[PDB]
A and B are shown apart, each in its own frame.
Chain A
Amino acid sequence: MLTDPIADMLTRIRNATRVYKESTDVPASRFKEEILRILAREGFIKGYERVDVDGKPYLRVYLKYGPRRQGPDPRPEQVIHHIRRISKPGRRVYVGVKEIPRVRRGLGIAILSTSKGVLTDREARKLGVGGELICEVW
C-alpha cells in the first residue's frame, strides 16, 4: 500500500539505474513531478513525461548514465550515484535556512519541500528559506 510514495519513487529510480534501464514509470503525482522536475532542471535525467497503463497515470522517467568504459566491467558510470530520502514518514526532518545541508561539498544536491515551492540547497539558501528536507541526490 506504499507508506511513503516519494521514498518509493526514489528507490524505483535507484533500482532502475543499477542495471542501466531506459525509463521507469513511477505512479504519477504532482509532488513527484515537482521533484522529478528538479532532477531534470538540474540534470540527473533526460526528464519525465505523463503516461498511462489502463486509465492509470504513471510517469516515464528517462535515466542518464556516463560514458562506456575501458577495462573489465565496461559498464558506464552513473549520473545518479546515490539517492536516499532524508525526512521520512516516521521521522519528519525539518530545517531552518541556516541548518540546511551542503551535499557532497557543493557537488551534490538536497531537494526539499517548502512554503514557497520545492527548492534545493542552493535554491532555498539563496531564496532565503527552509522547509522539510526531502532527500539528497548526487
Chain B
Amino acid sequence: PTINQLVRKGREKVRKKSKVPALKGAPFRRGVCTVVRTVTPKKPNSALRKVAKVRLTSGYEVTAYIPGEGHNLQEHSVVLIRGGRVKDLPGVRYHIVRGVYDAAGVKDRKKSRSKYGTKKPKEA
C-alpha cells in the first residue's frame, strides 16, 4: 500500500473474541446445575467424562467440566465456574472450581491440591 493509501484507508486494528463469556469480565461465575451427565471424548480418545450444564446467574447456561475423580453433584447443586475449555468434549468451555459451595473437594487426593480443592491432611 502506498503511503497515500495509508493516509486514506489507514491500517485496521485486530481485536479478538473473548474465548469465554463468563460474563462481566468476571474471574469466575456462580451457578446451579441443570443437568449432571457423562459425555464422551472426540477425535482419537475414548472415555466417560463427568460434566454438568450450569444455569449461571446471568440467565445463561453452559456445559461445564468436572475435574478429578468422582464427585457429588446433583440436579440442584450450586457451584462456581472457572473457565478453561477441554480440547476433547466439543461443548464444554468452562471448568467447575472444586471445593466451593455444593462441590466437594476430591476424595482421598494428596498430590497437587490447589487444583482439585482438597484440604491438606494431617500426617499424625
Contacts and interface: CB of A to CB of B under 8 A. Distances in A.
Answer whether A and B touch in the complex at a CB cut-off of 8 Å.
Answer: yes
Tier of interface size on chain B: under 10
Contacts of B124: none
Interface residues of A, number: 2
Interface in A86-128: 90-91
A90 B4 CA distance: 7
B45 interface: no
Contacts of B4: 90
A91 B2 CA distance: 10
A63 to B, nearest CB: 32
Nearest to A90: B3
Contacts of A91: 3
A35 B3 CA distance: 26
Nearest to B2: A90
Nearest to A91: B3
A91 B3 CA distance: 7
Interface string B1-18: 011100000000000000
Contacts of B2: 90
Interface in A58-97: 90-91
Interface in B74-101: none
B9 to A, nearest CB: 15
Nearest to A88: B3
A10 to B, nearest CB: 19
B123 to A, nearest CB: 65
B67 to A, nearest CB: 57
A27 B2 CA distance: 27
Nearest to B3: A91
A91 B5 CA distance: 12
A138 B3 CA distance: 26
Interface in B22-46: none
Contacts of A90: 2-4
Contacts of B3: 90-91
A133 B33 CA distance: 69
A92 to B, nearest CB: 10
4 contacts: A90-B2, A90-B3, A90-B4, A91-B3
Interface of A: 90-91
Ranked nearest first, the 4 interchain pairs of A and B with the lowest CB-CB distance are A91-B3, A90-B3, A90-B4, A90-B2
